[PDB]
């Protein structure tokens, strides 16, 4: 009923679910003396994140 | 004499290998993690020239 109310399909739900449980950072910048690795969060940890 | 021979036995340590030398050497310094890519080349050139 709530899927029809807001007008959303199951494919969209699956795509948004499988695209929010990752963690990837692929850079490294030099602060004039040493390297600094760039990391980005995104994992699903608690129920507040699923919601 | 067989008894007197007990003096050096306890005065000599036990070692697994001798150090066998080769005609070459390998220099390896203990360092720290943080390092860039240009400073590494600079340090390498300095150590080689020294």
Sequence length of chain B is 50
Chain A residue nearest residue B40, CA to CA: A34
Chain B residue nearest residue A31, CA to CA: B36
Neighbouring CB atoms inside 10 A of A18's CB total 9
Neighbouring CB atoms inside 10 A of A30's CB total 13
CB contact under 8 A, B34 and A30: no
Task: Judge whether A35 is closer than 8 Å to chain B, CB to CB.
Answer: yes
Instruction: List the structure tokens of A35.
Output: 């390297």
Q: Under 8 Å CB-to-CB from A42, ≥6 apart: which residues?
A: A20, A21, A22, A23, A24
> How far is it, in rounded angstroms, from Cα A27 to Cα B41?
20
Residues of B with CB under 8 A from a CB of A: 34-37, 39
List the one residue out of A24, A23, A16, A25 whose CA is nearest residue A50: A16
Judging contacts by C-beta atoms under 8 Å, the chain A residues touching residue B34 are 33-35
Method used to obtain the model: cryo-EM
Resolution (A): 2.8
- Residues A39, A24: contact at Cβ < 8 Å? no
Looking at the DSSP bridge assignments, the partners of residue A37 are: A28
Judging contacts by C-beta atoms under 8 Å, the chain B residues touching residue A35 are 34-36
Going by the DSSP 8-state scheme, the letter that residue A24 receives in this structure is -
């Amino acid at each position: 009923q709530r899927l029809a109310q807001y007008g959303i399909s199951l494919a969209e739900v699956k795509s948004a679910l499988d695209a929010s449980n990752q963690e990837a950072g692929g850079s490294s910048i030099e602060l004039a003396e040493a390297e600094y690795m760039v990391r980005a969060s995104g994992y699903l940890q608690t129920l507040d994140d699923f919601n | 004499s067989v008894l007197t021979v007990l003096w050096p036995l306890n005065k000599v340590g036990g070692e697994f290998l001798p150090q066998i030398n080769e005609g070459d050497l390998l220099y390896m310094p203990s360092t720290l993690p943080g390092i860039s890519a240009a400073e590494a080349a600079s340090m390498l050139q300095k150590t080689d020239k020294l």
